[PDB]
Structures are given as C-alpha cells and as structure tokens.
Design a binder for this molecule. Structure first.
Ligand SMILES: *[C@H](C)[C@H]1/C(=C/c2[nH]c(/C=C3N=C(/C=C4\NC(=O)C(CC)=C4C)C(C)=C\3CCC(=O)O)c(CCC(=O)O)c2C)NC(=O)[C@@H]1C
Ligand SMILES: *[C@H](C)[C@H]1/C(=C/c2[nH]c(/C=C3N=C(/C=C4\NC(=O)C(CC)=C4C)C(C)=C\3CCC(=O)O)c(CCC(=O)O)c2C)NC(=O)[C@@H]1C
Lengths: 158, 158
C-alpha cells in the first residue's frame, strides 16, 4: 500500500526524467524467478498490467540459473537496440512481446539483498543510452531500495 | 555534520529509552580496527570524549582479527556483569577503563556493509538485559544504518 506508493513515485519519476516509454519494477522470488509489481507507461502503448492489476510472466531462465546474474555485482545492462544485441532467441522473443526496442535495467538492493530490478524501456525506436542516464538510474534504484527497506523496518517492528 | 546530528539523535534516544549510563557509536576502519565517533553520557560519569572532541582508542585485537566477529552475522552480545563473564584480561581491562559494568552491543549495517557498532552501557551496577531491550536496540541500529546510507546517497550524488 505504502509500498505501491513508493513504486508508483519511483517509476513515474524515471519515466519523467528519462523520457522513456515504459518503466517496470521486477521483484525476485526466493528461487530467483520474479514478478512484475509495478508499471509506469505512456498512454500510447499497450500496458503490461491488465484490468485485474495482474502482470504477464517473464520467465527468464538465465537470471534464475545465475541467481540474478550481473546484478549480484551492482552492475547494470544498457542495450540501445535489442535487434542488434546478439541475444538468444527465447530472450529476444520476450523483448519483442513486451514491445522493448531498447532497455536500461539496473539492480535494486534492499539492505544487503538483491531484491529486484528497475527497468527503463524505449518501445518504438532504438536509443543510445548516455553514461549519465545509466548513472542516474543506478542511483534512483539505490534510493528505491532504501525506501523499501525503511518501510519494512517500520512496518514489521512495533 | 548532518551525520553527527543523526548520531546524536540515535545515541540520546538509546540512552533515554534504555535508561543506561552511556551510549557509544563505533565505526570500523577498513582494517577492522575502529574509532568512536559519538557518545551520549549522563552528567554524573566521566565522559570518554575530551575537550578537543577526541576519543580514546579501544584496540580490540579480536574484532580486528575476526573482521567484526559475530557482528558479521547480525548478532549482538549482551553482558550483564563484565566481572563474571570470563573475559580475557586485556578485554576486561578496557571494559574497566571505560567504566563498563554491563553492556549491550549490536551491529550497525549500512546498506550491505557492517559499518560499526552501537553500544549501550551500565556504569555503576550490573544489569540483566531483557530480551526485549536486545530486540529494540537491534532495530534502532538497523534504523541508524539506513539513515547513514540515505545520507551518503544524497551527499555523494548531485
Ligand atoms: C530462454 C528460454 C529465456 C531467456 C534466456 C536469457 N536471458 C538472458 C539475459 C537477460 N534476461 C534479462 C531479463 C530481464 N530484462 C528486464 O528488463 C526484465 C524486467 C525488469 C527482465 C526480467 C536480463 C536483464 C538479462 C541480462 C542478464 C545479465 O546478467 O547480463 C540471457 C543471456 C543473454 C542472451 O540473450 O544470450 C539468456 C540466454 N530469457 C527469456 O525471457 C527466455 C524465456
Ligand atoms: C587483547 C589484547 C584485547 C581484546 C581481546 C578480546 N576482545 C574480545 C571480544 C570483544 N571485544 C569487543 C569490543 C567492543 N565492545 C564494545 O562495546 C565496543 C565499543 C562499541 C568495542 C570496541 C566486543 C563487542 C567483543 C565480543 C566480540 C564477539 O564477536 O563476540 C575477545 C573475546 C572475548 C574474550 O574476552 O575472551 C578478546 C580476547 N580486547 C581488548 O580491548 C584487548 C586490548
């Protein structure tokens, strides 16, 4: 509740600051599968969130098998054109399915834990992500993670 | 500056809530030695902080050699009477030097790192620390660590 407010604020802020088309918050499950729990999207695009406020599944075997992959090391991935990135077909198929032409995805650490991912997406054209934008989203995600942990500390004690 | 305000608020809050005699904030150095950086103490006791706002050294070889010891695992140590605890003499000597008769010392995690320790001390009598008090100080330290990390995130970016 207070949490969805945090996710809304952050996601809308990213979309506003980066002028991207979609922003997603993705939370890892214990087995390193994950779940979308928030979307900010411009009105011209089909939303991933349906009318029951449910999201599609992105079953990324690679993140799961590598228990978060590069994100374990506080690293991000910026891809300017998914079509030229040399991705595995099952991965590219999901990128296309979610109308992702370019993405910038950074880790969200909550306390000491890799809690999830924060993604910024361009839907209708490639995008050369600037080093500054990467640095900015990295910090927005750090701030999100601290907000989540702060909320947990208050909610779960007294 | 804003940091010393955080340390003051936390330390004074602990001393107030626990009705203990002294509270100390101890920050680890890279080599797992450490430094006192704040004290809250009742007026009837000699302070550890001198007129130059410098603190004495507590050179604890055990914390250093064990890179933080039990505190690496989010554990605390509560000792009701240092005189009956079976401590090594070099350790007991420092406890006596700092007028510590009973202590409750918990870890302070800043993001993913064991940043320091938060200690509550009784100076003039033994004290049986209640499980609740241990649980409370543990959370006050969690909150302190989040405040420190939040301050760092804001101070060091833009
Ligand atoms: C094959 C059956 C499935 C598959 C394989 C796959 N994935 C990757 C690499 C990554 N997948 C992601 C997933 C996401 N990006 C986002 O923006 C979001 C929402 C926030 C998700 C869930 C990411 C970030 C990576 C990079 C991971 C890294 O550590 O670098 C690979 C490796 C790269 C490649 O394509 O060869 C593979 C093989 N993903 C699927 O969806 C298939 C069902
Ligand atoms: C011997 C030359 C020196 C020595 C040895 C020593 N220390 C310990 C165990 C601990 N020492 C501390 C230190 C602190 N308690 C506080 O409240 C503060 C300020 C915040 C400090 C710096 C702590 C917390 C422990 C417990 C550590 C743990 O992981 O359990 C030992 C082991 C216990 C024993 O006495 O045998 C030893 C041998 N400490 C000194 O000061 C000597 C100079």
């Amino acid at each position: 509740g207070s949490l969805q407010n945090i996710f809304r604020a952050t996601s809308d802020e990213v979309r506003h600051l980066l002028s991207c088309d979609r922003v997603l918050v993705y939370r890892f499950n214990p087995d390193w599968s994950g779940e979308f729990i928030h979307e900010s999207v411009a009105q011209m695009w089909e939303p991933l969130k349906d009318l029951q406020n449910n999201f599609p599944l992105w079953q990324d075997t690679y993140l799961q098998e590598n228990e978060g992959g590069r994100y374990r090391n506080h690293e991000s991935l910026a891809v300017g054109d998914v079509e030229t990135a040399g991705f595995t077909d099952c991965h590219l198929d999901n990128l296309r399915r979610f109308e992702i032409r370019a993405f910038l995805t950074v880790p969200v650490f909550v306390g000491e834990q890799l809690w999830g991912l924060l993604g910024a997406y361009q839907n209708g054209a490639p995008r050369h992500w600037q080093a500054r934008e990467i640095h900015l989203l990295h910090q927005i995600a750090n701030q999100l993670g601290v907000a989540v942990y702060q909320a947990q500390l208050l909610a779960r004690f007294q």
